[PDB]
């Protein structure tokens, strides 16, 4: 009963709720390009380690 | 706005003092000498140094210049 009711909508894979940042689990401003799945604010700090650099 | 920055001017003056008989009135031969006689991370600065060294040599032919002392 309540086990089935618990998080039944969350079990569905669709939606902004399913996708979250891989560093902070925040579902807002997610960079899905190249399947990065990182929020923009976290990407700003982790860009150098990933390999991105500021040019032009 | 084509003024030679103090770095360029000092480097060119040192070049003229160190090598005077090895320089000329043209720019390209002077730059060719500059590449060997100077070590720098840039080529724009080398070109500017060569140009101002040519200017210094042209001035020196007419008369002595302030800041350069040839022994």
């Amino acid at each position: 009963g309540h086990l089935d009711q618990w998080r039944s909508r969350q079990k569905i894979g669709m939606g902004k709720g399913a996708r979250c940042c891989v560093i902070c689990s925040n579902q807002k401003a997610l960079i899905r390009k190249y399947e990065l799945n990182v929020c923009r604010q976290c990407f700003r700090e982790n860009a150098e380690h990933i390999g991105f650099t500021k040019l032009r | 706005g084509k003024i030679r920055t103090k770095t360029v001017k000092r480097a060119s003056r040192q070049v003229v003092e160190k090598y005077y008989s090895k320089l000329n009135f043209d720019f390209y031969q002077n730059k060719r000498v500059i590449m060997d006689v100077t070590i720098a991370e840039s080529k724009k600065l080398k070109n500017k140094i060569a140009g101002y060294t040519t200017h210094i040599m042209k001035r020196l032919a007419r008369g002595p210049v302030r800041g350069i002392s040839l022994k």
């Binding site: 990182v38 982790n46 990933i50 | 480097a11 040192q14 160190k18 006689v37 720098a40 991370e41």
Partner: protein, 212 residues
């Protein structure tokens, strides 16, 4: 299915960021100054650069085996495909990431901010750095927050040459009053070997070879 070339590098960068963050949080107590990895068919061979390599190793490799287990469980590495190595940094005072940690420990030890920052700068200057900058910001003198910066030597802050000639690191020190930010920037002197320093001449300087 095989992953695309533009996706494999993204995965590798994400993995490196994961490993760097995990190692930073784990070895914050020790003085650690970097991590590299060289994947091959046989083995991964992750290397860490630190200062307190004795405590990173532990007794009979206790902590290094614990870290290897951590990484293996995290990244599903097959048994025997992963190894961890630790190397002592050649110069302790030339690593901002170690110096900030040391300064954070000094701050958390209830030491005065001016004295701790001055000691950090003195050690960095003794280590041979061309210049050092230390910034401490937060509620130091009471409810109102202030920022104090202590400088010595040369420090370039413009262009892209500073991203190579200067190494920087920032940490958050948590105190009963609140959070205090500590930042340490070091100007690495040029060394022809390339182990420390950029190994190239400064963009500004022009040197004329002495005639024979």
């Amino acid at each position: 299915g095989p992953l695309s070339k533009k996706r494999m590098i993204i995965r590798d960068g994400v993995f490196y960021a994961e490993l760097f963050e995990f190692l930073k949080r784990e070895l914050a107590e020790e003085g650690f100054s970097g991590v590299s990895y060289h994947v091959t068919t046989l083995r991964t061979e992750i290397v860490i650069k630190a200062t307190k390599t004795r405590e990173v190793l532990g007794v009979n490799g206790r902590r290094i085996r614990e870290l290897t287990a951590c990484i293996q469980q995290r990244f599903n590495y097959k048994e025997g495909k992963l190894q961890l190595y630790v190397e002592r940094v050649e110069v302790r005072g030339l690593s901002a990431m170690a110096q900030v940690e040391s300064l954070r420990f000094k701050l958390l030890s209830n030491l005065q901010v001016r004295r701790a920052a001055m000691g950090i700068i003195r050690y960095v200057m003794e280590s041979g750095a061309k210049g050092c900058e230390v910034t401490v910001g937060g509620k130091i003198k009471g409810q109102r927050a202030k920022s104090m910066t202590f400088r010595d030597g040369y420090m370039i802050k413009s262009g892209t040459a500073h991203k190579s000639f200067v190494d920087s690191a920032c940490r958050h020190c948590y105190m009963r009053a609140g959070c205090i930010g500590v930042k340490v920037k070091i100007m690495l002197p040029g060394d022809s070997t390339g182990r420390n320093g950029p190994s190239e001449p400064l963009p500004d300087v022009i040197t004329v070879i002495e005639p024979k």
